[PDB]
Amino acid sequence: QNETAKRELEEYIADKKAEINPRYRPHYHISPPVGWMNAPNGFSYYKGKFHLFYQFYPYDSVWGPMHWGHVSSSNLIDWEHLPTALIPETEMCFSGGAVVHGDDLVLLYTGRVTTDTDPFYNETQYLAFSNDGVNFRKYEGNPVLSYVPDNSADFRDPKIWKFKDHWYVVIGSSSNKQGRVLLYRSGDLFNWEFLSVLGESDGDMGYMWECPDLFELGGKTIFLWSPQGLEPKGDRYKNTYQTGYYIGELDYETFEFKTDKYFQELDYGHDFYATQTIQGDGKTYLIGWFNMWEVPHLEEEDGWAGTTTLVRELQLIGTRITMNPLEGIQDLRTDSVHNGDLEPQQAIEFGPTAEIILQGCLDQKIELLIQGKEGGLVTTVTWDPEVGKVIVNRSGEVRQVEWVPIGKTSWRLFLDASSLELFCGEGEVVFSSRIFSDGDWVVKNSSPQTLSVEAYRLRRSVPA
Ligand SMILES: OC[C@H]1O[C@@](CO)(O[C@H]2O[C@H](CO)[C@@H](O)[C@H](O)[C@H]2O)[C@@H](O)[C@@H]1O
Numbered sequence: 001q002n003e004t005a006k007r008e009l010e011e012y013i014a015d016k017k018a019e020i021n022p023r024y025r026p027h028y029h030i031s032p033p034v035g036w037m038n039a040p041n042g043f044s045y046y047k048g049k050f051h052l053f054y055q056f057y058p059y060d061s062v063w064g065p066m067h068w069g070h071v072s073s074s075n076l077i078d079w080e081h082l083p084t085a086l087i088p089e090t091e092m093c094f095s096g097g098a099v100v101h102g103d104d105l106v107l108l109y110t111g112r113v114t115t116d117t118d119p120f121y122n123e124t125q126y127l128a129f130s131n132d133g134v135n136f137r138k139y140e141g142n143p144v145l146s147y148v149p150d151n152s153a154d155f156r157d158p159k160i161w162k163f164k165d166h167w168y169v170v171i172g173s174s175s176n177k178q179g180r181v182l183l184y185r186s187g188d189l190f191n192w193e194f195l196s197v198l199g200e201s202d203g204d205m206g207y208m209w210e211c212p213d214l215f216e217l218g219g220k221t222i223f224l225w226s227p228q229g230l231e232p233k234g235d236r237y238k239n240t241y242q243t244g245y246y247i248g249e250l251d252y253e254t255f256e257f258k259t260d261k262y263f264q265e266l267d268y269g270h271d272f273y274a275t276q277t278i279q280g281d282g283k284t285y286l287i288g289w290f291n292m293w294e295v296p297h298l299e300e301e302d303g304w305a306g307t308t309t310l311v312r313e314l315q316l317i318g319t320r321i322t323m324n325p326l327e328g329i330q331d332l333r334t335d336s337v338h339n340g341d342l343e344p345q346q347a348i349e350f351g352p353t354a355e356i357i358l359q360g361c362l363d364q365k366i367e368l369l370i371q372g373k374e375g376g377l378v379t380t381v382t383w384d385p386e387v388g389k390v391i392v393n394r395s396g397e398v399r400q401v402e403w404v405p406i407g408k409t410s411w412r413l414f415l416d417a418s419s420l421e422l423f424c425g426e427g428e429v430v431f432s433s434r435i436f437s438d439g440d441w442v443v444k445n446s447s448p449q450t451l452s453v454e455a456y457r458l459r460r461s462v463p464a
Pocket residue numbers: 038039055063066094095096110156157210211228274293
């Protein structure tokens with residue numbers, strides 16, 4: 001590693017840290033120490049700790065020359081910052097995965113380099129290694145994988161896993177302005193054999209397929225990815241770009257992904273894009289970037305942008321991936337703020353953090369009004385039984401979906417200094433939206449019915 005380049009960045013961060021307005025900084029969501037965060041990267045388990053990286057531009061609250069930020073956790077709730085894992089050189093350090101080989105945590109990441117031809121960039125897969133889980137050195141012979149079908153300039157966001165005697169990777173690409181994902185495999189992590197175009201847009205599924213993922217859940221293969229170029233369709237695909245999944249079966253003989261290509265959005269909120277998953281304890285954990293491309297970031301002017309979501313546990317119930325907060329998220333709970341009846345127009349007061357478990361009768365309207373103690377911008381969460389929809393109105397911008405409850409009719413709502421995550425029922429309908437208002441959260445019952453509300457303040461689990 002370049003000791004000069006590193007030390008200079010560590011001291012830029014340690015100094016720039018004092019200029020970070022804390023007003024919107026999350027208490028219990030992963031945020032960059034300073035500057036810009038986008039897609040989470042290389043979700044891994046190495047030496048008794050979950051490791052997570054992320055697309056990181058230290059020097060400003062907007063996108064720029066891509067670094068890998070780095071955090072670790074015992075419980076997937078509390079996270080410590082580590083030194084910047086990857087600093088760009090000739091290549092920007094674009095998204096990718098991480099896997100444990102020997103004593104080593106191995107990062108497989110896309111290196112984007114400039115060119116002087118129409119695309120004006122090229123994408124290949126770079127290796128970096130660590131034995132201490134702190135310092136990362138790039139492989140002398142990078143890139144280890146350069147071949148992409150139709151010589152497409154788009155070739156990014158490898159998700160690597162081990163099955164039998166091979167590492168497999170799914171990688172995002174385009175061709176004739178159609179999104180696609182490519183399956184490769186290696187015996188040694190250095191030499192990569194192309195297997196198949198796992199899926200491709202027929203025209204209606206966008207021009208680029210970012211942050212692909214592939215894993216088993218509920219006895220099925222999930223292809224989870226971030227397509228760009230979907231048209232809004234009724235209530236769906238309203239965000240700048242989408243994250244969603246196909247259900248099917250990956251055949252490890254034919255390397256064919258057999259699916260009906262029934263697309264579903266994972267998260268119905270305003271600010272959900274680009275996911276990572278890991279499997280352990282017989283569970284499937286997922287985390288996403290808690291922002292959206294080409295829309296205002298109200299925290300930008302405070303010298304930072306972006307958080308992750310809460311880590312969610314996945315299940316496949318029928319045809320639906322449910323998301324729920326971690327079983328032990330209740331460890332965040334400090335003060336018990338409310339229990340039982342919350343009458344019409346009655347309000348609950350928090351600090352910057354809130355957990356609310358609410359139930360009403362689904363025969364009548366449910367509505368929460370969420371706003372700062374000192375007023376400012378409003379977010380409303382509504383059950384409208386006329387249309388059978390959950391509606392998150394974030395400062396006038398609507399996200400809504402039909403909700404057919406699996407079982408539980410209760411909602412679990414998590415507020416952080418500048419975020420909202422609504423888990424409806426058993427997690428079949430989830431909204432993740434960034435929210436901003438003036439001061440400590442006040443939540444008012446706007447419903448024409450009394451709600452049952454269990455409410456807590458939540459402690460910090462991440463740095464300022
Ligand atoms: O930081 C690059 C990293 O982010 C992803 C997913 O968000 O792609 C981004 O890259 C470009 C940044 O301007 C955009 O063209 C693209 O739309 C944006 O999503 C990953 O694909 C990539 O590794």
